[PDB]
């Protein structure tokens, strides 16, 4: 059923490669492309490429689904993984992580090194190469384009968001404020991850208006952020096996969700444990956090939080979802909540 | 006249960090962004800006250059600044480079580090936000959007051919010909230093014809071309204190135009020189590098290279001008040919 939708989703990803790896000495260098794509857009759930998909055949009328079309909504959706890819590839190397999607991060490969940041770079341009190729000719051209490059900017702007606030070697648990984490979260996450997908099957639908747009919106920037509140929660309390990739926040001295809660609960003397062990690579350091989170009943916080969440994002669907169909944002929904 | 031209440009810039840089919260990551901007937009000779400005006067109708159309034409300028930009600070990565415009590198910077990917990926997000903001409503926007995205990735495919034929630790010698060359700075430069400027103008006035881009770009690429190879010879042989830069090629392994050169003159003892001290840090490698070079005349190879490049640059004018004014590509000849 949805393995079924995610199936049909990867099937297309060989004919995406082969338009983008199709000029002789130039060839090492596509040659190269191709390595970078199938070692980094293939591995993960491809939620938010398919939820192009989905929102496309639920928002567009069937009659007017033919195959060029449809063609059109799976080739958009690759260009959502694609940009997910570049923002991986490059957070990976800034967050100094180890494993992503159960394999080691393409930066940390033998032969690849910094080199990895050229790669990112690549991925971001394979998206208009594919807008380009596959919906020149369409109405919504220069929409998709505005909304993938202000999508990226905005990302951009909560990763600068997200590094200043955790400086490498400094305390910064005055900043971890409840405040920062929604902004960083906001931008960083929610906008590209959430709003995205559905704008641009909208687009595809010829649904354009401001304020549908604004509508979409108010939903999918609160799923996006406890999207990032779970991704926080998972970074320490999830199994590797399962989330794919092994965790950094507290290493990195991140403004999580956790620290966030950790500090409106701590008493003088948790406050202190906190500040002496926060930040730091040394795993005993990180060891101590983590049982500071588990004595300050962080996992059942979170439980708490994601009830109360789900329960919020669906009062925010029975307001704002109309006219489109409620099925659109449920969709979604059910896969972000577990 | 000259530096008369460079200050009129300079003095839009305070402008345009004030546009890109005017939501509370997120004040912290505007503050990041007006950083980058003037540490890394601001030092250099801004002439791949200036040609945008200098062709869009030569190319459009003084009684069409009002005040509005001429603040388009240098905001396109400074489009192309930050397109260098966005790909110097992540070239002097990827380079493991010293400094840049007689400055210690941005990611060298303490404090930076590999932060500077995000930067760089800030600067590139700026040309769009200032291509909506200043030329949305135009009739050559999305020819301006398409140029810069087009010009990005041909870069990028020539920054994967440097790489790939620079691996670090590797002996790559049987790699270093004058076919590999030519393709990796047709693409790592050609396209996005020479051609870009003048055909952002060129879409401006209003010249968006097929035949007349590629006229323009039969001289502009063999330009870029030359300007490549300049830029490998004085990475070893100019002036630090006149370049602003350290030279890296060497250590680096990189297909530069002087080792290409080497092998095609080198006996076979001077070929086991050059393999067994290229591509390395040591200093006296480098150093035995360089008196091979010396040994085998390259500066006075490179002499006569420049004189018989710039009468074949001269003689594509005279062939591909027309209907250009001959002097839109003749400011740009003067300033390249030293
Ligand atoms: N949102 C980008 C990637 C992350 O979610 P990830 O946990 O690295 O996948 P981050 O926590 O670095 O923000
Ligand atoms: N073209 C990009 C930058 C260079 O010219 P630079 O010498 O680093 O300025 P490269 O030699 O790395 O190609
Ligand atoms: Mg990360
Ligand atoms: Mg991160
Ligand atoms: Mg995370
Ligand atoms: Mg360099
Ligand atoms: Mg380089
Ligand atoms: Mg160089």
Known sequence: VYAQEKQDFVQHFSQIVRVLTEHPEIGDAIARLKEVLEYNAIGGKYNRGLTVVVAFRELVEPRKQDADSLQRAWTVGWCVELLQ???????????????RRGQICWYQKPGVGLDAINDANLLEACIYRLLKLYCREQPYYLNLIELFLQSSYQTEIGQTLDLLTAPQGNVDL??????????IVKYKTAFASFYLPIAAAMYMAGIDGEKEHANAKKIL????????????????????????????????????????????????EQYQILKENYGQKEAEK???????????????????????????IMALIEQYAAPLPPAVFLGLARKIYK
């Open 85 to 99: 890819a570049f923002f991986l590839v490059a957070d990976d190397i800034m967050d100094s992580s180890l494993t």
């Open 286 to 312: 990180v060891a101590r956090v983590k049982a500071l989170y588990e004595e300050l009943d962080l996992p059942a916080v979170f439980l708490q939080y994601e009830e109360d969440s789900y329960s919020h």
């Open 174 to 183: 005055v900043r971890f404020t409840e405040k920062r984490y929604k902004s």
């Open 221 to 268: 920037l609160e799923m996006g952020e406890f999207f990032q509140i779970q991704d926080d929660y998972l970074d320490l309390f999830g199994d590797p096996s399962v989330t794919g990739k092994i965790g950094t926040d507290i290493q990195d001295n991140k403004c999580s969700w956790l620290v966030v809660q950790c500090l409106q609960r701590a008493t003088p």
